[PDB]
Amino acid sequence: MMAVEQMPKKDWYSILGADPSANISDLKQKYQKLILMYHPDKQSTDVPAGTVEECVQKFIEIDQAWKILGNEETKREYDLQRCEDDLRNVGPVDAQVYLEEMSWNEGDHSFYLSCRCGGKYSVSKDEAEEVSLISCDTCSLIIELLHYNHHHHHH
Ligand SMILES: [Zn+2]
């Protein structure tokens, strides 16, 4: 039981200094301006190595807030967007898993699978009912969540 405010606290909103109440509009014009000023404008060619670490960092930085200027709810729809599209392209490469294998927990009513490399997955009884494509967070592979009915004896 805690307050349901969910305020910002990342380098994103700090990169553009845009309050959590701001909108994409105000952030639009403020972006080209803020970012512009954020770019390097000093006269110093004495940055060995770091010169790149800074350039490449500033690129991902300005872009970081550009989309997720705030919390995840800010603009995460775009993230998963390319994901769901990048996952389908892979299709069935690893293998298919049976719901009878995914250890079901009566505590939270959910199932979870463990890869044979190191990582593992965990989906909710409801989630797995809405989704199907499940990839591993370690090795380049993906499995399919198939729900097959076997046990049938009324509870
Ligand atoms: Zn794996």
Tab-separated table of N, CA and C in Angstrom, residues 6-143:
chain	number	residue	atom	x	y	z
A	6	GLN	N	3.871	7.604	-9.303
A	6	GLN	CA	4.803	7.171	-10.337
A	6	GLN	C	5.464	8.370	-11.012
A	7	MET	N	6.318	9.066	-10.267
A	7	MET	CA	7.014	10.234	-10.795
A	7	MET	C	8.301	9.824	-11.504
A	8	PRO	N	8.816	10.718	-12.361
A	8	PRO	CA	10.046	10.472	-13.118
A	8	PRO	C	11.283	10.467	-12.228
A	9	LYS	N	12.343	9.819	-12.698
A	9	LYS	CA	13.590	9.740	-11.945
A	9	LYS	C	14.696	9.117	-12.790
A	10	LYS	N	14.739	9.483	-14.067
A	10	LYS	CA	15.749	8.962	-14.979
A	10	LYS	C	16.475	10.099	-15.693
A	11	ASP	N	17.576	9.767	-16.358
A	11	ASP	CA	18.359	10.758	-17.083
A	11	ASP	C	17.573	11.311	-18.268
A	12	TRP	N	16.490	10.630	-18.621
A	12	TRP	CA	15.652	11.052	-19.737
A	12	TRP	C	15.070	12.438	-19.489
A	13	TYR	N	14.143	12.525	-18.540
A	13	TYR	CA	13.507	13.794	-18.206
A	13	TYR	C	14.543	14.824	-17.766
A	14	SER	N	15.705	14.339	-17.339
A	14	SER	CA	16.778	15.216	-16.887
A	14	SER	C	17.579	15.751	-18.071
A	15	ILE	N	17.536	15.022	-19.182
A	15	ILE	CA	18.256	15.424	-20.385
A	15	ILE	C	17.555	16.584	-21.084
A	16	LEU	N	16.233	16.631	-20.957
A	16	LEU	CA	15.444	17.691	-21.577
A	16	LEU	C	14.826	18.598	-20.517
A	17	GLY	N	15.014	18.235	-19.252
A	17	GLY	CA	14.471	19.028	-18.165
A	17	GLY	C	12.993	19.316	-18.339
A	18	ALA	N	12.283	18.387	-18.972
A	18	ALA	CA	10.851	18.545	-19.201
A	18	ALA	C	10.041	17.854	-18.109
A	19	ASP	N	9.220	18.628	-17.409
A	19	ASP	CA	8.390	18.090	-16.338
A	19	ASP	C	7.542	16.925	-16.840
A	20	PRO	N	7.067	16.091	-15.903
A	20	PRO	CA	6.239	14.926	-16.227
A	20	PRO	C	4.850	15.320	-16.718
A	21	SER	N	4.533	16.606	-16.613
A	21	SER	CA	3.235	17.111	-17.045
A	21	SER	C	3.307	17.646	-18.473
A	22	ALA	N	4.514	17.999	-18.905
A	22	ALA	CA	4.721	18.521	-20.250
A	22	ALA	C	4.096	17.605	-21.297
A	23	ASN	N	4.004	18.098	-22.528
A	23	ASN	CA	3.425	17.324	-23.620
A	23	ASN	C	4.420	17.174	-24.768
A	24	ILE	N	4.087	16.314	-25.724
A	24	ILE	CA	4.949	16.081	-26.875
A	24	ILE	C	5.183	17.370	-27.657
A	25	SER	N	4.177	18.238	-27.668
A	25	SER	CA	4.273	19.508	-28.380
A	25	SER	C	5.381	20.378	-27.795
A	26	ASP	N	5.201	20.793	-26.546
A	26	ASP	CA	6.185	21.629	-25.868
A	26	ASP	C	7.564	20.976	-25.895
A	27	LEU	N	7.582	19.647	-25.876
A	27	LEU	CA	8.835	18.900	-25.896
A	27	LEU	C	9.436	18.883	-27.298
A	28	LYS	N	8.581	19.034	-28.304
A	28	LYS	CA	9.026	19.038	-29.692
A	28	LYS	C	9.969	20.207	-29.958
A	29	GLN	N	9.476	21.420	-29.734
A	29	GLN	CA	10.278	22.621	-29.949
A	29	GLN	C	11.410	22.708	-28.930
A	30	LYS	N	11.139	22.255	-27.712
A	30	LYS	CA	12.135	22.281	-26.646
A	30	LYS	C	13.239	21.262	-26.908
A	31	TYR	N	12.924	20.249	-27.708
A	31	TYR	CA	13.889	19.206	-28.037
A	31	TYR	C	14.979	19.744	-28.957
A	32	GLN	N	14.571	20.248	-30.117
A	32	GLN	CA	15.513	20.793	-31.087
A	32	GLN	C	16.384	21.873	-30.452
A	33	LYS	N	15.820	22.586	-29.483
A	33	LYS	CA	16.544	23.648	-28.793
A	33	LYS	C	17.469	23.071	-27.726
A	34	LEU	N	16.885	22.373	-26.758
A	34	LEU	CA	17.657	21.767	-25.679
A	34	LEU	C	18.805	20.930	-26.234
A	35	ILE	N	18.465	19.925	-27.034
A	35	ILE	CA	19.468	19.053	-27.632
A	35	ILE	C	20.555	19.863	-28.330
A	36	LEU	N	20.138	20.842	-29.125
A	36	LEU	CA	21.075	21.693	-29.850
A	36	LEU	C	22.111	22.290	-28.903
A	37	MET	N	21.642	22.818	-27.778
A	37	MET	CA	22.529	23.417	-26.788
A	37	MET	C	23.343	22.349	-26.068
A	38	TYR	N	22.789	21.143	-25.987
A	38	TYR	CA	23.464	20.035	-25.322
A	38	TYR	C	24.695	19.596	-26.108
A	39	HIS	N	24.620	19.721	-27.430
A	39	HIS	CA	25.729	19.338	-28.297
A	39	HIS	C	27.003	20.086	-27.914
A	40	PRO	N	28.155	19.551	-28.342
A	40	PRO	CA	29.462	20.150	-28.055
A	40	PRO	C	29.676	21.460	-28.805
A	41	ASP	N	30.145	22.477	-28.092
A	41	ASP	CA	30.396	23.783	-28.691
A	41	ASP	C	31.638	24.429	-28.086
A	42	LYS	N	32.596	23.599	-27.689
A	42	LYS	CA	33.834	24.088	-27.093
A	42	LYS	C	35.013	23.870	-28.037
A	43	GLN	N	36.116	24.564	-27.770
A	43	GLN	CA	37.311	24.445	-28.596
A	43	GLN	C	38.413	23.697	-27.852
A	44	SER	N	38.381	22.370	-27.937
A	44	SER	CA	39.375	21.538	-27.269
A	44	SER	C	39.546	20.207	-27.994
A	45	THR	N	40.679	20.052	-28.671
A	45	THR	CA	40.966	18.828	-29.410
A	45	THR	C	41.865	17.898	-28.604
A	46	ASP	N	41.824	18.042	-27.283
A	46	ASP	CA	42.635	17.211	-26.400
A	46	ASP	C	41.778	16.152	-25.713
A	47	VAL	N	40.968	15.452	-26.499
A	47	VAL	CA	40.098	14.411	-25.968
A	47	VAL	C	40.363	13.072	-26.646
A	48	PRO	N	41.490	12.439	-26.287
A	48	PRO	CA	41.885	11.143	-26.849
A	48	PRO	C	40.980	10.008	-26.380
A	49	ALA	N	40.436	9.260	-27.334
A	49	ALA	CA	39.555	8.142	-27.018
A	49	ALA	C	38.189	8.635	-26.555
A	50	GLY	N	38.173	9.370	-25.447
A	50	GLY	CA	36.927	9.888	-24.918
A	50	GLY	C	36.112	10.623	-25.965
A	51	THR	N	36.798	11.205	-26.943
A	51	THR	CA	36.132	11.943	-28.008
A	51	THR	C	35.020	11.115	-28.641
A	52	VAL	N	35.265	9.817	-28.785
A	52	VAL	CA	34.284	8.913	-29.374
A	52	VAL	C	33.243	8.486	-28.345
A	53	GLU	N	33.711	8.128	-27.152
A	53	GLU	CA	32.819	7.699	-26.081
A	53	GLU	C	31.798	8.785	-25.755
A	54	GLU	N	32.176	10.037	-25.998
A	54	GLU	CA	31.293	11.166	-25.728
A	54	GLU	C	30.323	11.387	-26.885
A	55	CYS	N	30.837	11.287	-28.106
A	55	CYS	CA	30.017	11.477	-29.297
A	55	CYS	C	28.940	10.401	-29.395
A	56	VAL	N	29.350	9.146	-29.236
A	56	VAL	CA	28.421	8.024	-29.306
A	56	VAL	C	27.435	8.055	-28.143
A	57	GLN	N	27.886	8.571	-27.005
A	57	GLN	CA	27.043	8.657	-25.818
A	57	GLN	C	25.988	9.747	-25.977
A	58	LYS	N	26.406	10.893	-26.504
A	58	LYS	CA	25.497	12.016	-26.711
A	58	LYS	C	24.411	11.658	-27.720
A	59	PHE	N	24.751	10.786	-28.663
A	59	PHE	CA	23.804	10.361	-29.687
A	59	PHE	C	22.655	9.566	-29.071
A	60	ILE	N	23.001	8.574	-28.257
A	60	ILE	CA	22.000	7.739	-27.604
A	60	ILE	C	21.305	8.495	-26.476
A	61	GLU	N	22.000	9.479	-25.915
A	61	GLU	CA	21.449	10.280	-24.828
A	61	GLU	C	20.287	11.138	-25.319
A	62	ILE	N	20.589	12.078	-26.209
A	62	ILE	CA	19.572	12.966	-26.757
A	62	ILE	C	18.389	12.174	-27.303
A	63	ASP	N	18.676	11.010	-27.876
A	63	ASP	CA	17.635	10.155	-28.435
A	63	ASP	C	16.877	9.428	-27.329
A	64	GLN	N	17.577	9.121	-26.241
A	64	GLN	CA	16.970	8.424	-25.114
A	64	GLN	C	15.694	9.128	-24.662
A	65	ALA	N	15.828	10.389	-24.264
A	65	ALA	CA	14.685	11.172	-23.810
A	65	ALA	C	13.757	11.511	-24.971
A	66	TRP	N	14.322	11.594	-26.169
A	66	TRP	CA	13.544	11.912	-27.361
A	66	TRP	C	12.261	11.089	-27.409
A	67	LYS	N	12.369	9.813	-27.056
A	67	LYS	CA	11.217	8.918	-27.057
A	67	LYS	C	10.681	8.720	-25.643
A	68	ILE	N	11.494	8.109	-24.786
A	68	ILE	CA	11.101	7.863	-23.405
A	68	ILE	C	11.509	9.021	-22.502
A	69	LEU	N	11.132	10.233	-22.898
A	69	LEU	CA	11.456	11.426	-22.122
A	69	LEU	C	11.072	11.245	-20.658
A	70	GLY	N	10.039	10.442	-20.418
A	70	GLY	CA	9.590	10.198	-19.058
A	70	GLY	C	9.602	8.725	-18.700
A	71	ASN	N	8.625	8.304	-17.904
A	71	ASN	CA	8.528	6.910	-17.484
A	71	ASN	C	8.330	5.993	-18.687
A	72	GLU	N	8.170	4.701	-18.420
A	72	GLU	CA	7.972	3.720	-19.480
A	72	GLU	C	6.669	3.985	-20.230
A	73	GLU	N	5.649	4.413	-19.496
A	73	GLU	CA	4.349	4.701	-20.093
A	73	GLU	C	4.449	5.858	-21.083
A	74	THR	N	5.544	6.607	-21.001
A	74	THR	CA	5.762	7.742	-21.888
A	74	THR	C	5.574	7.344	-23.348
A	75	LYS	N	6.480	6.512	-23.849
A	75	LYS	CA	6.413	6.053	-25.233
A	75	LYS	C	7.093	4.696	-25.388
A	76	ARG	N	6.563	3.691	-24.699
A	76	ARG	CA	7.119	2.345	-24.761
A	76	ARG	C	6.501	1.554	-25.911
A	77	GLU	N	5.322	1.981	-26.350
A	77	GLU	CA	4.625	1.313	-27.443
A	77	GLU	C	5.542	1.146	-28.653
A	78	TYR	N	6.474	2.079	-28.812
A	78	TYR	CA	7.410	2.039	-29.928
A	78	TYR	C	8.455	0.947	-29.724
A	79	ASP	N	8.923	0.808	-28.489
A	79	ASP	CA	9.924	-0.199	-28.158
A	79	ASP	C	9.446	-1.592	-28.557
A	80	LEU	N	8.379	-2.052	-27.912
A	80	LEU	CA	7.822	-3.370	-28.199
A	80	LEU	C	7.402	-3.477	-29.660
A	81	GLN	N	7.118	-2.332	-30.276
A	81	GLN	CA	6.705	-2.298	-31.674
A	81	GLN	C	7.689	-3.067	-32.550
A	82	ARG	N	8.935	-2.605	-32.581
A	82	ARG	CA	9.969	-3.249	-33.381
A	82	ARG	C	10.290	-4.639	-32.839
A	83	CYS	N	10.014	-4.845	-31.556
A	83	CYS	CA	10.273	-6.131	-30.916
A	83	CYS	C	9.351	-7.211	-31.472
A	84	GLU	N	8.049	-7.016	-31.298
A	84	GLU	CA	7.062	-7.978	-31.781
A	84	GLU	C	7.261	-8.261	-33.267
A	85	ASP	N	7.806	-7.281	-33.982
A	85	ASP	CA	8.050	-7.424	-35.413
A	85	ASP	C	9.373	-8.140	-35.669
A	86	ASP	N	10.318	-7.973	-34.751
A	86	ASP	CA	11.628	-8.602	-34.877
A	86	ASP	C	11.589	-10.043	-34.379
A	87	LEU	N	10.590	-10.354	-33.560
A	87	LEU	CA	10.439	-11.697	-33.012
A	87	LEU	C	9.769	-12.625	-34.022
A	88	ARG	N	8.717	-12.129	-34.664
A	88	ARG	CA	7.988	-12.913	-35.653
A	88	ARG	C	8.912	-13.355	-36.785
A	89	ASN	N	9.829	-12.473	-37.171
A	89	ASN	CA	10.772	-12.772	-38.243
A	89	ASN	C	11.603	-14.007	-37.908
A	90	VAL	N	11.763	-14.274	-36.616
A	90	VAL	CA	12.532	-15.424	-36.162
A	90	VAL	C	11.709	-16.704	-36.248
A	91	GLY	N	10.453	-16.624	-35.819
A	91	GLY	CA	9.581	-17.783	-35.855
A	91	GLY	C	10.119	-18.939	-35.036
A	92	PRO	N	9.568	-20.141	-35.269
A	92	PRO	CA	9.983	-21.353	-34.556
A	92	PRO	C	11.383	-21.808	-34.951
A	93	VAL	N	12.369	-21.445	-34.137
A	93	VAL	CA	13.753	-21.818	-34.401
A	93	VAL	C	14.273	-22.786	-33.344
A	94	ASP	N	13.923	-22.526	-32.088
A	94	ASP	CA	14.353	-23.375	-30.983
A	94	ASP	C	13.527	-24.657	-30.931
A	95	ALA	N	12.266	-24.527	-30.534
A	95	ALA	CA	11.373	-25.675	-30.441
A	95	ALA	C	10.045	-25.287	-29.799
A	96	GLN	N	9.161	-26.267	-29.638
A	96	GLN	CA	7.856	-26.026	-29.036
A	96	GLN	C	7.790	-26.603	-27.626
A	97	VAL	N	7.164	-25.863	-26.717
A	97	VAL	CA	7.032	-26.302	-25.333
A	97	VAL	C	5.572	-26.566	-24.977
A	98	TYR	N	5.344	-27.591	-24.164
A	98	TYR	CA	3.993	-27.950	-23.749
A	98	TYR	C	3.664	-27.347	-22.386
A	99	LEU	N	2.448	-26.827	-22.255
A	99	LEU	CA	2.007	-26.220	-21.004
A	99	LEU	C	2.121	-27.209	-19.850
A	100	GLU	N	2.157	-28.496	-20.180
A	100	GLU	CA	2.266	-29.542	-19.170
A	100	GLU	C	3.667	-29.573	-18.566
A	101	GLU	N	4.602	-28.891	-19.221
A	101	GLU	CA	5.981	-28.841	-18.751
A	101	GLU	C	6.207	-27.626	-17.856
A	102	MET	N	5.642	-26.491	-18.254
A	102	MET	CA	5.782	-25.258	-17.488
A	102	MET	C	5.213	-25.425	-16.082
A	103	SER	N	6.101	-25.554	-15.101
A	103	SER	CA	5.686	-25.723	-13.713
A	103	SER	C	4.675	-24.654	-13.314
A	104	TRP	N	3.462	-25.088	-12.991
A	104	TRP	CA	2.403	-24.168	-12.590
A	104	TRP	C	2.412	-23.951	-11.081
A	105	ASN	N	2.281	-22.693	-10.669
A	105	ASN	CA	2.274	-22.351	-9.250
A	105	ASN	C	0.872	-21.968	-8.789
A	106	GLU	N	0.375	-22.670	-7.775
A	106	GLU	CA	-0.955	-22.403	-7.241
A	106	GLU	C	-0.961	-21.123	-6.410
A	107	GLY	N	0.229	-20.661	-6.039
A	107	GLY	CA	0.341	-19.450	-5.245
A	107	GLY	C	-0.138	-18.221	-5.992
A	108	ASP	N	0.379	-18.027	-7.200
A	108	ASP	CA	-0.001	-16.881	-8.018
A	108	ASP	C	-0.684	-17.334	-9.304
A	109	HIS	N	-0.950	-18.633	-9.402
A	109	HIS	CA	-1.600	-19.194	-10.580
A	109	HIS	C	-0.889	-18.753	-11.857
A	110	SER	N	0.322	-19.262	-12.061
A	110	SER	CA	1.108	-18.916	-13.239
A	110	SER	C	2.092	-20.030	-13.581
A	111	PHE	N	2.714	-19.923	-14.752
A	111	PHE	CA	3.678	-20.922	-15.199
A	111	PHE	C	5.023	-20.274	-15.516
A	112	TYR	N	6.091	-21.059	-15.410
A	112	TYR	CA	7.434	-20.562	-15.682
A	112	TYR	C	8.312	-21.661	-16.272
A	113	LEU	N	9.138	-21.291	-17.243
A	113	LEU	CA	10.034	-22.244	-17.891
A	113	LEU	C	11.492	-21.851	-17.683
A	114	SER	N	12.375	-22.844	-17.699
A	114	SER	CA	13.801	-22.599	-17.510
A	114	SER	C	14.605	-23.144	-18.689
A	115	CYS	N	15.353	-22.263	-19.342
A	115	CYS	CA	16.170	-22.652	-20.487
A	115	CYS	C	17.287	-23.601	-20.062
A	116	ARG	N	18.023	-24.117	-21.040
A	116	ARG	CA	19.119	-25.038	-20.768
A	116	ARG	C	20.468	-24.360	-20.995
A	117	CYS	N	20.513	-23.052	-20.763
A	117	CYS	CA	21.739	-22.285	-20.943
A	117	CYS	C	22.067	-21.481	-19.687
A	118	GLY	N	21.044	-20.866	-19.101
A	118	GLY	CA	21.244	-20.075	-17.901
A	118	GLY	C	20.042	-19.214	-17.568
A	119	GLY	N	19.441	-18.616	-18.591
A	119	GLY	CA	18.283	-17.768	-18.381
A	119	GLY	C	16.994	-18.561	-18.284
A	120	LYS	N	15.911	-17.884	-17.920
A	120	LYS	CA	14.611	-18.532	-17.791
A	120	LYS	C	13.480	-17.541	-18.050
A	121	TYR	N	12.268	-18.061	-18.204
A	121	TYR	CA	11.103	-17.222	-18.458
A	121	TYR	C	10.002	-17.494	-17.437
A	122	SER	N	9.022	-16.598	-17.380
A	122	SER	CA	7.912	-16.738	-16.445
A	122	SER	C	6.702	-15.935	-16.914
A	123	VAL	N	5.640	-16.642	-17.289
A	123	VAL	CA	4.419	-15.995	-17.757
A	123	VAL	C	3.249	-16.293	-16.827
A	124	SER	N	2.301	-15.362	-16.761
A	124	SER	CA	1.130	-15.522	-15.906
A	124	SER	C	0.054	-16.347	-16.608
A	125	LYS	N	-0.769	-17.026	-15.817
A	125	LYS	CA	-1.843	-17.852	-16.360
A	125	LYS	C	-2.691	-17.059	-17.348
A	126	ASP	N	-2.788	-15.754	-17.125
A	126	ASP	CA	-3.568	-14.883	-17.998
A	126	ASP	C	-2.731	-14.411	-19.182
A	127	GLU	N	-1.476	-14.067	-18.913
A	127	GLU	CA	-0.572	-13.597	-19.957
A	127	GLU	C	-0.411	-14.647	-21.051
A	128	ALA	N	-0.036	-15.858	-20.648
A	128	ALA	CA	0.152	-16.953	-21.594
A	128	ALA	C	-1.120	-17.213	-22.393
A	129	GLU	N	-2.258	-16.819	-21.831
A	129	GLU	CA	-3.543	-17.011	-22.493
A	129	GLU	C	-3.762	-15.957	-23.574
A	130	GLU	N	-3.012	-14.864	-23.488
A	130	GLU	CA	-3.125	-13.782	-24.459
A	130	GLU	C	-1.959	-13.809	-25.443
A	131	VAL	N	-0.802	-14.262	-24.969
A	131	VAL	CA	0.389	-14.341	-25.806
A	131	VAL	C	0.690	-15.782	-26.199
A	132	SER	N	1.825	-15.985	-26.861
A	132	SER	CA	2.230	-17.316	-27.297
A	132	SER	C	3.722	-17.355	-27.609
A	133	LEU	N	4.214	-16.298	-28.247
A	133	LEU	CA	5.626	-16.211	-28.605
A	133	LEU	C	6.477	-15.867	-27.387
A	134	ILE	N	7.396	-16.763	-27.043
A	134	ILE	CA	8.275	-16.552	-25.900
A	134	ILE	C	9.732	-16.807	-26.274
A	135	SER	N	10.572	-15.796	-26.080
A	135	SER	CA	11.991	-15.909	-26.398
A	135	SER	C	12.830	-15.979	-25.126
A	136	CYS	N	14.063	-16.450	-25.264
A	136	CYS	CA	14.968	-16.570	-24.126
A	136	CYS	C	15.806	-15.306	-23.963
A	137	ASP	N	16.054	-14.924	-22.714
A	137	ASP	CA	16.843	-13.733	-22.422
A	137	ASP	C	18.306	-14.095	-22.181
A	138	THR	N	18.902	-14.796	-23.140
A	138	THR	CA	20.295	-15.208	-23.031
A	138	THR	C	20.824	-15.719	-24.367
A	139	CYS	N	20.258	-16.825	-24.836
A	139	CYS	CA	20.673	-17.417	-26.103
A	139	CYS	C	19.695	-17.055	-27.217
A	140	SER	N	20.213	-16.938	-28.436
A	140	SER	CA	19.388	-16.592	-29.587
A	140	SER	C	18.452	-17.742	-29.949
A	141	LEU	N	17.315	-17.808	-29.264
A	141	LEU	CA	16.333	-18.858	-29.512
A	141	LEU	C	14.955	-18.446	-29.001
A	142	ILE	N	13.918	-19.078	-29.538
A	142	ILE	CA	12.550	-18.781	-29.134
A	142	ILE	C	11.685	-20.037	-29.153
A	143	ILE	N	10.731	-20.105	-28.229
A	143	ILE	CA	9.835	-21.251	-28.142
A	143	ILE	C	8.379	-20.824	-28.297
